[PDB]
Amino acid sequence: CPLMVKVLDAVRGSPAINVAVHVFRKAADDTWEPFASGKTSESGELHGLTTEEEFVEGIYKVEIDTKSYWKALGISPFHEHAEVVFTANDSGPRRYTIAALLSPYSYSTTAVVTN
Amino acid sequence: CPLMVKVLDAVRGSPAINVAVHVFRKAADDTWEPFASGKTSESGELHGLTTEEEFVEGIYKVEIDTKSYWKALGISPFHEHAEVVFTANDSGPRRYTIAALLSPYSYSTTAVVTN
Amino acid sequence: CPLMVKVLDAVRGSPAINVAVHVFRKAADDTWEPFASGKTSESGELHGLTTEEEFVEGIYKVEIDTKSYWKALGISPFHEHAEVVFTANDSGPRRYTIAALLSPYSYSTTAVVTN
Amino acid sequence: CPLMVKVLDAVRGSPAINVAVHVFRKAADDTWEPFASGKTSESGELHGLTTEEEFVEGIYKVEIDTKSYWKALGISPFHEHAEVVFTANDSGPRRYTIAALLSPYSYSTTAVVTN
Numbered sequence: 208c209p210l211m212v213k214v215l216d217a218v219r220g221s222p223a224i225n226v227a228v229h230v231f232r233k234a235a236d237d238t239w240e241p242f243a244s245g246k247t248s249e250s251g252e253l254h255g256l257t258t259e260e261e262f263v264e265g266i267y268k269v270e271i272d273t274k275s276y277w278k279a280l281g282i283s284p285f286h287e288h289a290e291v292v293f294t295a296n297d298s299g300p301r302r303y304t305i306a307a308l309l310s311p312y313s314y315s316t317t318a319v320v321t322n
Numbered sequence: 323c324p325l326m327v328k329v330l331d332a333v334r335g336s337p338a339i340n341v342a343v344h345v346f347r348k349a350a351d352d353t354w355e356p357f358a359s360g361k362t363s364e365s366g367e368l369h370g371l372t373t374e375e376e377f378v379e380g381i382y383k384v385e386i387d388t389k390s391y392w393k394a395l396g397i398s399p400f401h402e403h404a405e406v407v408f409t410a411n412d413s414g415p416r417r418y419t420i421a422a423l424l425s426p427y428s429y430s431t432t433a434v435v436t437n
Numbered sequence: 438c439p440l441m442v443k444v445l446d447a448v449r450g451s452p453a454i455n456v457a458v459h460v461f462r463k464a465a466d467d468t469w470e471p472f473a474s475g476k477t478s479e480s481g482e483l484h485g486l487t488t489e490e491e492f493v494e495g496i497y498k499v500e501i502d503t504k505s506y507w508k509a510l511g512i513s514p515f516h517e518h519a520e521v522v523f524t525a526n527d528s529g530p531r532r533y534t535i536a537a538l539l540s541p542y543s544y545s546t547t548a549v550v551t552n
Numbered sequence: 553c554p555l556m557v558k559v560l561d562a563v564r565g566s567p568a569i570n571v572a573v574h575v576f577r578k579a580a581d582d583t584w585e586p587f588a589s590g591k592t593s594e595s596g597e598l599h600g601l602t603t604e605e606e607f608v609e610g611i612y613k614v615e616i617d618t619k620s621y622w623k624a625l626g627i628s629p630f631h632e633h634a635e636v637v638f639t640a641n642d643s644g645p646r647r648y649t650i651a652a653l654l655s656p657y658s659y660s661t662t663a664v665v666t667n
């Protein structure tokens with residue numbers, strides 16, 4: 208994976224399972240074009256979003272659908288979603304892990320970027 | 323003051339000063355329209371974004387211009403900005419504080435909803 | 438006020454009220470001795486722990502009694518408490534704010550050192 | 553591993569490599585007895601601390617030596633260390649991952665607990 212997403216649940220201390228994730232890439236015109244999407248597994252991880260061929264230089268937005276996740280568990284959370292926006296591969300190809308830690312009124316996000 | 327933004331710098335252990343903040347309201351066509359903006363003060367806070375009269379129920383996006391903040395300090399950041407998207411409702415009686423804690427490759431955001 | 442503690446609840450999106458806080462100073466035999474204590478107020482803050490005169494250079498431990506906080510809300514927490522250990526120095530001119538954001542299986546703490 | 557520690561660096565967006573970790577277990581008398589120790593690998597992970605036989609019910613403290621980590625990188629951080637204190641295996645045996653995200657004036661810690 209050049210691009211992986213990992214989500215944890217801070218209330219239960221567990222992976223956040225079945226969290227929808229949509230990724231977009233800023234187009235020529237300056238619009239958010241759909242790029243890839245998927246759902247976290249039982250480990251809270253989403254693999255297979257893209258390949259190193261597809262995953263060119265650009266500005267990407269990883270939208271993590273936190274509100275849906277919390278609602279389905281009986282919690283009415285503050286945020287609509289967690290959005291993570293970043294320039295990727297601008298110094299050549301790299302592997303990105305976008306991690307998110309979710310609470311109903313709070314989240315954190317960290318990127319681990321390696322060669 | 324129904325809406326307030328407060329940003330901290332986790333690398334220096336200080337308020338994040340002079341950070342640009344842009345707020346958008348979701349329009350009926352699904353577009354984000356400018357709503358309010360400013361720069362955090364010396365205390366890292368941004369007051370007077372809006373009034374009770376103009377802060378109606380709706381979906382808002384608060385964008386914190388983290389990349390510019392880090393670049394002015396000579397530090398290479400990961401994110402384009404941090405975005406906080408939420409629905410404001412029951413109008414009341416409710417003050418919203420969006421807090422953000424910034425690192426170069428990581429941020430958290432929390433909502434403190436009081437009164 | 439050279440030392441202040443502020444705690445937020447990430448599950449409710451609110452100040453964490455009535456949280457017990459115990460502070461210890463490291464004694465020359467390597468033991469922690471009681472230094473100051475109190476409970477956070479309605480704003481989630483705890484002021485008047487100490488004075489400039491009694492807050493000398495030294496190693497301090499601030500223990501936030503998170504487990505009791507969660508149990509009074511009917512929620513099963515992971516940690517016994519959150520501990521924040523640091524050296525206070527250059528005496529000045531320096532106000533220390535220890536901030537903490539609490540979830541049942543997770544917390545962050547940040548130091549805001551001003552003046 | 554019934555007990556694993558994983559540490560990331562929020563400034564560089566990378567695993568925090570070679571971070572010393574010491575674990576203690578509260579004894580009968582009420583003292584912190586040394587239990588296990590080790591250093592994070594290139595992945596930021598510390599495996600092999602203990603076995604399911606050794607890792608009995610008890611109150612454990614995982615001390616993550618953050619100050620040493622930051623100093624060796626030319627940063628003078630706020631905290632002496634990150635301490636994570638919790639009751640383990642009190643409802644039977646479980647697998648614990650203690651994760652930490654480090655910034656010079658800030659850290660978070662999350663526990664992922666599975667069967």
Ligand SMILES: Oc1cc(CCl)ccc1Oc1ccc(Cl)cc1Cl
Binds near residue numbers: 328420421538546
């Ligand atoms: O983001 C925060 C994270 C922590 C845990 Cl490190 C503590 C405080 C924070 O920021 C705040 C934001 C708003 C208000 Cl009213 C109070 C606070 Cl303390």
Ligand SMILES: Oc1cc(CCl)ccc1Oc1ccc(Cl)cc1Cl
Binds near residue numbers: 214560660661
């Ligand atoms: O970012 C994180 C920070 C902490 C400390 Cl509170 C705990 C979990 C995190 O999420 C990850 C971070 C890095 C990697 Cl490789 C995987 C994951 Cl699930």
